[PDB]
Symmetry: C6
Amino acid sequence: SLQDPFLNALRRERVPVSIYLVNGIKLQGQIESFDQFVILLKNTVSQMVYKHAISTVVPS
Amino acid sequence: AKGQSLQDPFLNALRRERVPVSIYLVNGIKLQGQIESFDQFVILLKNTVSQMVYKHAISTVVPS
Amino acid sequence: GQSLQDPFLNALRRERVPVSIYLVNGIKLQGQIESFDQFVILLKNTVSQMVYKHAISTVVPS
Amino acid sequence: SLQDPFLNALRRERVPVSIYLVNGIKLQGQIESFDQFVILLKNTVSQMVYKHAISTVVPS
Amino acid sequence: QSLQDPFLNALRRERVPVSIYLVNGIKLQGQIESFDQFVILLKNTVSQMVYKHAISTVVPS
Amino acid sequence: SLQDPFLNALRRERVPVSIYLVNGIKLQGQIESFDQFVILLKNTVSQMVYKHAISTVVPS
RNA sequence: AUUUUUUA
Ligand SMILES: Nc1ncnc2c1ncn2[C@@H]1O[C@H](COP(=O)(O)OP(=O)(O)O)[C@@H](O)[C@H]1O
Ligand SMILES: Nc1ncnc2c1ncn2[C@@H]1O[C@H](COP(=O)(O)OP(=O)(O)O)[C@@H](O)[C@H]1O
Ligand SMILES: Nc1ncnc2c1ncn2[C@@H]1O[C@H](COP(=O)(O)OP(=O)(O)O)[C@@H](O)[C@H]1O
Ligand SMILES: Nc1ncnc2c1ncn2[C@@H]1O[C@H](COP(=O)(O)OP(=O)(O)O)[C@@H](O)[C@H]1O
Ligand SMILES: [Mg+2]
Ligand SMILES: [Mg+2]
């Protein structure tokens, strides 16, 4: 897996990310955690985002 | 993390604590209600009535 | 923590409940649940139409 | 299965059908054949339609 | 795959110009160079790899 | 698999690529790596693109 | 373990 090391590194270092959704919505926050099918993105609140809804995960 | 170690406990906490949730769909529609039950593939969301939402249609689940 | 799909659809079918099936593109279909399997739901209104589950957002009584 | 008898009946009876795609396009023709993942729709030409792109198959 | 594979293989072997409609309505054109379970390689000016999950319809042009 | 050799050749030769997403957005960069589910695309940053959100990969 | 990252 490349996916898991990528997401874990972002999580560990609290890297600001943008998550672009397939419908054109852009979310921002930090990767709090993730598992097989979802990513927990935290900004003001923790929201569970389904991977099937995501196009890209983009660090800044 | 592996398997369902994030998703299942997240959804179960919402269900157990009867937390008002927003469920954003892939078409940008926001549903609201309480999580009555869920399985691997669907969530039963209760507001006025029970509706079966396919997880494949869901973008994001977050407390309201 | 068992399967929810077939019990939910079966109840709607058996009770003859008018349902709305919203698709992932927001289109709302209406009718009676006639039957269903692993992949599809047959929705009866003026005709029987076969709806792919992969395209369904929500099934709810109208 | 309910899918296979439904499509076989349309194919056998040469019923004019509408195939609605998830992107809102409506295709019309006759069910020529189908397998696990595709439906062949015949109008002036035979076109191969991926089931994943289809929302509903409706007699016209 | 008794329908899909022979349909695509006939297009490929006979080097038939095809149109591939994507789920976003974009129409690609070219000849099918090869395919596997998940992608189709489409050749026009260059070779591009098209994911089947993004394709609605394949038809001869 | 035709997919892996195609992506590997673009990666190894450091070919600038265009990745078109299913919503029509065009991403550009170099393929850094890929696995079953994702492609890591490098430009100003390394971003992770889910294959499910990709329509086409082509040299730019 | 009913297509919850995957040509129904
Ligand atoms: N996580 C998400 N997934 C899908 N759509 C979203 C998400 N967040 C917001 N949207 C959609 O983007 C649009 C603008 O969102 P915004 O007004 O910021 O949030 P809200 O409408 O919930 O207060 C709304 O149509 C909303 O449904
Ligand atoms: N659960 C759902 N899934 C997908 N689309 C939905 C859902 N609920 C409503 N919509 C769509 O969102 C748009 C606005 O909804 P709304 O006017 O509230 O419809 P309704 O009156 O049927 O609830 C409509 O196109 C509708 O079909
Ligand atoms: N056989 C088909 N399968 C899927 N989509 C189609 C088909 N034919 C047309 N479309 C879509 O519908 C839109 C308009 O159709 P049409 O007027 O026939 O354009 P064209 O002549 O370029 O196919 C196009 O943007 C195209 O993406
Ligand atoms: N292979 C493709 N897959 C998905 N979308 C595409 C593809 N080719 C073009 N598009 C969409 O159509 C638009 C116009 O096409 P074109 O001008 O050829 O692309 P470009 O943006 O590279 O100039 C693009 O901006 C893109 O949104
Ligand atoms: Mg079960
Ligand atoms: Mg999937």
